[PDB]
Amino acid sequence: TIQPGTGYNNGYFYSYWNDGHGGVTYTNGPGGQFSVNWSNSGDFVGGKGWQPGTKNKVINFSGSYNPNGNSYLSVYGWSRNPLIEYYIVENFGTYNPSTGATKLGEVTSDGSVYDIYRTQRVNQPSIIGTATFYQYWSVRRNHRSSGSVNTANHFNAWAQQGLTLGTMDYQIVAVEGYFSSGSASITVS
Numbered sequence: 001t002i003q004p005g006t007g008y009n010n011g012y013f014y015s016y017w018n019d020g021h022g023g024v025t026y027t028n029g030p031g032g033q034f035s036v037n038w039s040n041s042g043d044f045v046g047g048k049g050w051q052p053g054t055k056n057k058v059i060n061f062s063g064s065y066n067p068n069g070n071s072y073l074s075v076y077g078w079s080r081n082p083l084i085e086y087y088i089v090e091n092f093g094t095y096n097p098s099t100g101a102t103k104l105g106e107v108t109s110d111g112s113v114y115d116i117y118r119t120q121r122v123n124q125p126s127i128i129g130t131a132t133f134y135q136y137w138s139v140r141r142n143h144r145s146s147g148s149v150n151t152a153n154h155f156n157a158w159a160q161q162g163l164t165l166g167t168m169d170y171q172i173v174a175v176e177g178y179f180s181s182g183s184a185s186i187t188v189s
């Protein structure tokens with residue numbers, strides 16, 4: 001278990017962030033493994049991967065993901081210039097994060113169709129400070145907690161649609177929660 005922060009563990013970058021409300025623990029395990037256990041949490045994100053990510057990584061993940069309430073399991077990361085927060089959502093809990101969002105197309109990858117969306121965060125926290133920035137989403141129709149994500153298929157479809165990415169910052173497989181409960185154990189490579 002670690003303080004919220006970033007660093008490296010067993011060859012993998014990790015990021016663990018929370019809002020200080022309590023109710024969530026994040027643990028780094030061997031190799032690319034991490035666990036999250038939460039019960040009436042606040043807002044949080046944690047997981048393992050790479051710093052920087054790339055635009056053609058094939059990301060493999062496997063494990064168990066058991067949210068009770070609002071949570072996502074995604075390939076998650078940022079670009080700079082432009083500042084973008086992006087998600088390739090493989091599974092979620094009570095809330096589909098694209099609800100009410102503008103649909104920007106579809107892409108087929110790794111055994112499922114994904115729906116593509118763009119949203120905007122206004123004066124919200126980010127990797128560079130408070131900012132207004134777009135988020136890009138691919139939301140998998142057929143939910144799962146193991147698989148392979150060919151990120152190029154998503155990034156290329158986004159680019160085709162005008163959702164351009166700048167220089168990649170970190171890129172992880174993340175469990176995100178917003179005032180929920182759950183458990184998860186995920187191994188990345």
Ligand SMILES: O[C@@H]1[C@@H](O)[C@H](O[C@@H]2CO[C@@H](O[C@@H]3CO[C@@H](O)[C@H](O)[C@H]3O)[C@H](O)[C@H]2O)OC[C@H]1O
Pocket residue numbers: 015017045085121124125126127128129
């Ligand atoms: O110390 C600073 C860190 O706190 C900072 O981390 C990023 C802050 O932005 C976080 O993203 C939110 C996650 O939840 C989504 O729903 C929101 O739109 C995001 O804003 C991100 O996960 C952290 O990496 O990094 C910069 C450091 O200076």
